[PDB]
Structure 1
Amino acid sequence: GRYYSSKQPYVAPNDATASSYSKAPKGYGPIYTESMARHGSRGLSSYKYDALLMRMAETAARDGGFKSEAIKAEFVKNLSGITAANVENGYGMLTGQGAQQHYGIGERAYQRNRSLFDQAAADGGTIAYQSSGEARATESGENFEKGFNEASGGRLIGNVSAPTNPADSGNGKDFQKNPDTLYFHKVQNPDGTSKVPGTKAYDIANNYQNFVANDATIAGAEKTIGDNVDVKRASHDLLSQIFTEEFLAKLENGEYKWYNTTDGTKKGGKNCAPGADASKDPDACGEVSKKIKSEYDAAMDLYNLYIIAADMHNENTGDHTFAFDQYFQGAYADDARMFAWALDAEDFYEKGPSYAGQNETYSIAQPLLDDFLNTIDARVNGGSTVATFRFAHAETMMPFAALLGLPGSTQQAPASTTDVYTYGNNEWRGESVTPMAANVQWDVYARYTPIVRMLYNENEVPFRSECTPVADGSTWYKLTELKSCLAADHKTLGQDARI
């Protein structure tokens, strides 16, 4: 692999996959479809990794911490380039790769359900578009819409439900903001509003944040992985291609430390990326509390730049080109793998299945699962919405995948801070659980209880093993069966799930 972790660009299905999805059993025709997809490829989400590395670079230049003038120039040039590229694109914004990803996904979404949507055009069915409110999610949705309308020759353009709370009045006017199902991990919503204290959504978000902040097993496992001897040596060795031993030893013993502030000090005030308009791009001014205090921190920042570059192909142009893969060549390639583990670990423990004996890390996805089922009910009871397409985040997909027990997210780590999650003992990978444009789609047919089939990153998958399908070897499941087997006790209806 290349070890891009959760910044892995989307891998679209080849034509054989997209044309070989299973057919529903005889007598069942399509009545509904729905989706939740992560935003497509993006730039850096804020002036953070590049910011901190530039502060470190300024100190190394002042104290002679670079190994040579050529190495200094190379490092500073790459930092300046990726920062300039993100300033032009806007921090947190979708890239050309992400637009292409979602355009293809929307094309294939219409194509898989051509019958459903042609009939919906025939009899006034409506399509519901939803976003978290974050710009990159809404933009992903807009490109999905473009691809969907291209593949259907525009025949469904006048079949979109008008939002009651649109993401914006221009390109995003078709997108209902729904942070309760697409941004359930934080009290604050992307549009600046906040979830109301006392509400179910506020309770979910707040209790989650307090649990993760205060949980001793998560903190201990993450300490164990951060202090791992091989991880520490990889951090030091990666940085030793750039900085001198004196500089790095000073960093590791605590003599150097950098905050994301104007002069790198804890008290230094807000730091915005050079050339950026903070009023138009607030994300270009970083969180003042982020810091580099160890070789691990600096190396992980460098690794994050290496992996985000994989999502910035079309922006890596002109006079703001950049490259960081030269720091991960040969013997350093494996270093990336180890950083991929460390990053993945932080997500696994904080946002995914995490450790055994708890469900607080992934139960927060319950509203989304609730909506996945409720919308189907609305269609069965005679509603006219034939499709619900939602666009959100990795923070949405990780607990959603763990809650459903999707492939990759079925295995919790031991209740231990030393016997911890590893690539060897656990199936979870960020590159497969939540790549850019990661998406779950359900197709719902009916004769009788409806039946449901799932695609995950457009691979047809069974539901979790506890669920019983309509027949042996089938990927179609009774809606009653899903309501039973996706609940906390994961009870199957047994023979009653068969048709």
Structure 2
Amino acid sequence: GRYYSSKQPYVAPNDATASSYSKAPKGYGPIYTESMARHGSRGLSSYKYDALLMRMAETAARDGGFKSEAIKAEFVKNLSGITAANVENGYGMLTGQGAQQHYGIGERAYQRNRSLFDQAAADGGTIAYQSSGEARATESGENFEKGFNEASGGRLIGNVSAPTNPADSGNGKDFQKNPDTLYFHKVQNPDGTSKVPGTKAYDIANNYQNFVANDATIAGAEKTIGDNVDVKRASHDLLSQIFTEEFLAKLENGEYKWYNTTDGTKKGGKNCAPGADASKDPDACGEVSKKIKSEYDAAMDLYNLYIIAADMHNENTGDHTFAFDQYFQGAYADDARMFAWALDAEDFYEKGPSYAGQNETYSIAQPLLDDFLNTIDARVNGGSTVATFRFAHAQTMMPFAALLGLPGSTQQAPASTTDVYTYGNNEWRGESVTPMAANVQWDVYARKGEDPATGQRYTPIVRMLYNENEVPFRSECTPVADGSTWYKLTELKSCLAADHKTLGQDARI
């Protein structure tokens, strides 16, 4: 009933879920685990939604466009408060809720594989930490590492792999930057370097960016959704809590327009958030090209503040709090569901299954799937790294989930600009595919000895958790036995490849 889309705060497992993960078959014990997690909850990415609505508020106040002076005061208080809170935290930065999400995930990662890690501490095993290099990803990982270390009494602190390209020389010193697997959607890397032309990583990012920038199905479908009459009706319905009918009628008639500038006009300057140091926090300055032209723009901007306000829960104290939830109560939650669809649709079409007949939107995650299998192989073939813990982005998780065919990401939309992705015709939701701190974890077990039905060793087996729910792999994959969520590593190398073939009976133990 709250409709936070992919700003949904992570929902940690209850002690029932966390204690009922399936046991591996008799004879199999842990040898490896790994993860990729999105950063946790964050503040606003830049001075933009809050900036534009303040410009709109200024004009509404001048023109008598608020429904009352108390509603005006409350709206401006809410805008000022969340802006102030982002100046204080840093635009784009992890919040307290986001740190707590990753602390708990880290604690539970140690606990789920306690025997693996206690053995690693006694036998010289190593743990590898990786980040895209983006601050909120690295800081998420730092909090995971803190929770992991606290749960294990610090007994693994001396078993961390030393990065050759650390995210920073301070709290992030344990994090190897790996933007080829954790930032494969862009040529530019978060640390300010770029992928090198001609590398596989550069070509993957470059081809993807060129595809999405020019694809007519994606562009037409997003246009259909942006101009949908029910989205416009929802936008008006929401905004009428705050602004008068006359004010909104003028906006509907194109008589108002606001740019993200000092005075909301086209000739205004770059405006930075009040009290921000643009050299310390450049994201506190807005892109002047952003604008409110419609009720749709304004309502989607307000919805974005509501959902990020949930991410900023821990910051929402003191004398400049914000109460955007007040605008999405009762029947206005129906409006929130419309805005969540519009926001989800952009992500779905650009980074998820998207439309039928193409795999460009999610094939970009192949380097991460490659690494998920390659780091298992490194361990089974005699390496000492017992875990690889990775921290990244929604732009990592959405294509990865579609490439793997995870629950929620199994349905492409029609190859159509009018029969588009909707909540009625697709299971994809930001709140469940890629909440804040969304994560995929794989546990790998093995049986000692020589398999007398082959010449060599028993095949390692693999089990997946998605947002800490144990899930099967995609339906083409055959588990090791009836009733099992464990899969042979050989089976996964076959059934997760493009053909999705199964080894059939040879997948059974």
TM-score interval (norm. to shorter): over 0.9
Secondary structure in 2 aligned to 1:303?
Answer: helix
Secondary structure in 2 aligned to 1:362?
Answer: helix
Tell me how far apart the structure 2 counterparts of residues 61 and 69 of structure 1 sit (CA, whole Å). Answer: 9
Deviation at 1:247, TM superposition (A): 2.6
- CA offsets per residue over residues 177-231 of structure 1, 9 Å max, x none? 1111111111111111111222211111121111111111111111221222211
**TM-score after normalising by structure 2:** 0.96
Deviation at 1:267, TM superposition (A): 4.2
Tell me how far apart the structure 1 counterparts of residues 208 and 413 of structure 2 sit (CA, whole Å). Answer: 19
- CA offsets per residue over residues 258-292 of structure 1, 9 Å max, x none? 22222223343322110111111111112222221
- CA offsets per residue over residues 41-90 of structure 1, 9 Å max, x none? 11111111111111111222233322222221111110000000111111
Secondary structure in 2 aligned to 1:55?
Answer: helix
- CA offsets per residue over residues 104-158 of structure 1, 9 Å max, x none? 1011000000111011101111100001111111111111011101111111010
**Would you identify which runs of 4 or more consecutive aligned residues in structure 1 move more than 6 Å?**
none
Tell me how far apart the structure 2 counterparts of residues 320 and 301 of structure 1 sit (CA, whole Å). Answer: 20
**TM-score after normalising by structure 1:** 0.98
Secondary structure in 2 aligned to 1:84?
Answer: helix
Tell me how far apart the structure 1 counterparts of residues 26 and 39 of structure 2 sit (CA, whole Å). Answer: 36
- CA offsets per residue over residues 30-49 of structure 1, 9 Å max, x none? 11110000111111111111
Map of 2:50 onto structure 1: 50
Aligned residues: CA RMSD? 1.1
* Residues 280 and 449 (structure 1), Cα distance of their counterparts in 2 relative to 1, 3 Å cut: same
Tell me how far apart the structure 2 counterparts of residues 310 and 380 of structure 1 sit (CA, whole Å). Answer: 42
Instruction: Tell whether 2:139 aligns with 1:139.
Output: yes
Secondary structure in 2 aligned to 1:361?
Answer: helix
Compare 160-169 and 253-262 and name the one that shifted more.
Answer: 253-262
Map of 2:83 onto structure 1: 83
Secondary structure in 2 aligned to 1:391?
Answer: strand
Secondary structure in 2 aligned to 1:344?
Answer: helix
Tell me how far apart the structure 2 counterparts of residues 269 and 209 of structure 1 sit (CA, whole Å). Answer: 30
Tell me how far apart the structure 2 counterparts of residues 194 and 61 of structure 1 sit (CA, whole Å). Answer: 45
Compare 238-247 and 291-300 and name the one that shifted more.
Answer: 238-247
* Residues 161 and 344 (structure 1), Cα distance of their counterparts in 2 relative to 1, 3 Å cut: same
- CA offsets per residue over residues 289-310 of structure 1, 9 Å max, x none? 2221211111011001111111
Instruction: Tell whether 2:477 aligns with 1:478.
Output: no
Compare 219-228 and 93-102 and name the one that shifted more.
Answer: 219-228
Tell me how far apart the structure 1 counterparts of residues 134 and 261 of structure 2 sit (CA, whole Å). Answer: 25
Deviation at 1:250, TM superposition (A): 2.7
Tell me how far apart the structure 2 counterparts of residues 42 and 285 of structure 1 sit (CA, whole Å). Answer: 17
Deviation at 1:245, TM superposition (A): 2.6
Deviation at 1:254, TM superposition (A): 2.5
Name stretches of at least 5 consecutive residues in structure 1 with no aligned partner.
Answer: none
Secondary structure in 1 aligned to 2:361?
Answer: coil
Secondary structure in 2 aligned to 1:9?
Answer: coil
Tell me how far apart the structure 1 counterparts of residues 57 and 395 of structure 2 sit (CA, whole Å). Answer: 31
Secondary structure in 1 aligned to 2:470?
Answer: strand
Deviation at 1:244, TM superposition (A): 2.2
Deviation at 1:418, TM superposition (A): 1.7
Compare 15-24 and 192-201 and name the one that shifted more.
Answer: 192-201
Tell me how far apart the structure 2 counterparts of residues 266 and 33 of structure 1 sit (CA, whole Å). Answer: 53
Tell me how far apart the structure 1 counterparts of residues 288 and 196 of structure 2 sit (CA, whole Å). Answer: 26
Map of 1:383 onto structure 2: 383
Tell me how far apart the structure 2 counterparts of residues 101 and 429 of structure 1 sit (CA, whole Å). Answer: 20
Secondary structure in 2 aligned to 1:194?
Answer: coil
Secondary structure in 2 aligned to 1:382?
Answer: coil
- CA offsets per residue over residues 394-449 of structure 1, 9 Å max, x none? 11111111110000001111111221111111111110000011000000111222
Tell me how far apart the structure 1 counterparts of residues 58 and 191 of structure 2 sit (CA, whole Å). Answer: 35
Tell me how far apart the structure 2 counterparts of residues 191 and 307 of structure 1 sit (CA, whole Å). Answer: 27
